[PDB]
Amino acid sequence: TAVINHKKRKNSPRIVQSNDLTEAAYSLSRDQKRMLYLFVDQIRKSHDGICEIHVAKYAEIFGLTSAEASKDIRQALKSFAGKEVVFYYESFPWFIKPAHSPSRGLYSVHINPYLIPFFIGLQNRFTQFRLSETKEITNPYAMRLYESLCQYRKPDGSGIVSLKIDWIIERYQLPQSYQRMPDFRRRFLQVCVNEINSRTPMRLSYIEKKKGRQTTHIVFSFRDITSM
DNA sequence: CCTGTGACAAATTGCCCTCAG
DNA sequence: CTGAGGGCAATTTGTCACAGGT
DNA sequence: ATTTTTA
Ligand SMILES: [Mg+2]
């Protein structure tokens, strides 16, 4: 049995997406990525791109009060305006219409229809993971890294991944100061590895690769907790 | 050029409180 | 009661000066 | 439900 179907996980929603989206350049908050997980699930459960979110189900899934769930949704929704996702040279807006609330506790969004082929009809070159794996992660760049690791994950839960550092900076859109490699180490790399090791079922180590005086790549290795 | 760390600026966390319906 | 508002201190993330080649 | 990518 593959760990995607392990008994403790199987009941959580299966999030699935093309590797082009896993590799795309975009910048979303934790809260925005949490809602996008719910949109992809909904879309795949049956599409014109019009989706829904209930405050009450959001609070239940992420372990929040009703009031904070309402705050998270309202502010993340407004901040979606003007956000674009760039595939690799090809930019699309996430939303083609502002969000609105038809009735108390309910919100309605229109996801760009040109993005729907990135979430359905996948036969290969896709990324998969259970929502329960990511819902305790806090830092949004730790969410980006976890999805990239998942992209090379074998059915048994393990894998290895080399990632060029210039590429990480471009596609995750890290802030300016993380071009200085000691800041990249202390505020992105160590922080995100610690989050994955303590909030997911993945167990992760890494080694730096150098060319001359420059560090150019990180090489990641990992195994699943249910195999240990 | 490269490294780590102290410090300070700005953003984000989970909580708290009020009230309409 | 929920959930749509208003707020908080604690805590993390983003930036840079400095010391020094470990 | 599933698979093709790093190097
Ligand atoms: Mg919040």
Features:
monomer; 228 residues; alpha+beta; Arc Repressor Mutant, subunit A; 3-stranded antiparallel beta sheet; binds magnesium ion; DNA-binding; dna binding protein; Replication initiation protein Nucleoprotein complex Nucleic acid binding DNA binding; tetrameric
In short:
The chain is α+β, with helices and mostly antiparallel strands and about 230 residues long. The protein has helices spanning about 20, 30-45, 55-60, 65-80, 130-135, 140-150, 165-170, 180-200; strands spanning about 15-20, 50-55, 85, 90-95, 100-105, 105-110, 125-130, 160-165, 200-210, 215-225.
The CATH superfamily of the largest domain bears the name Winged helix-like DNA-binding domain superfamily/Winged helix DNA-binding domain
The SSE string, one letter per element, is EHHEHHEEEEEHHEHHEE
* Residue share in β-strands: 25-35%
Overall tally of domains: 2
Give structural notes.
The protein is an alpha+beta fold and 228 residues long. The protein has two domains: 12-135, Arc Repressor Mutant, subunit A, CATH 1.10.10.10; 136-226, Arc Repressor Mutant, subunit A. Helices cover 36% and strands 26% of the residues. The chain has helices spanning 19-22, 30-45, 55-62, 66-78, 131-134, 140-151, 165-171, 181-199; strands spanning 14-18, 50-54, 84-87, 90-93, 100-103, 106-110, 126-130, 159-164, 202-211, 214-224. Strands 2-6-5 form a three-stranded antiparallel β-sheet. It is globular. The two termini are 15 Å apart. The structure holds three DNA strands.
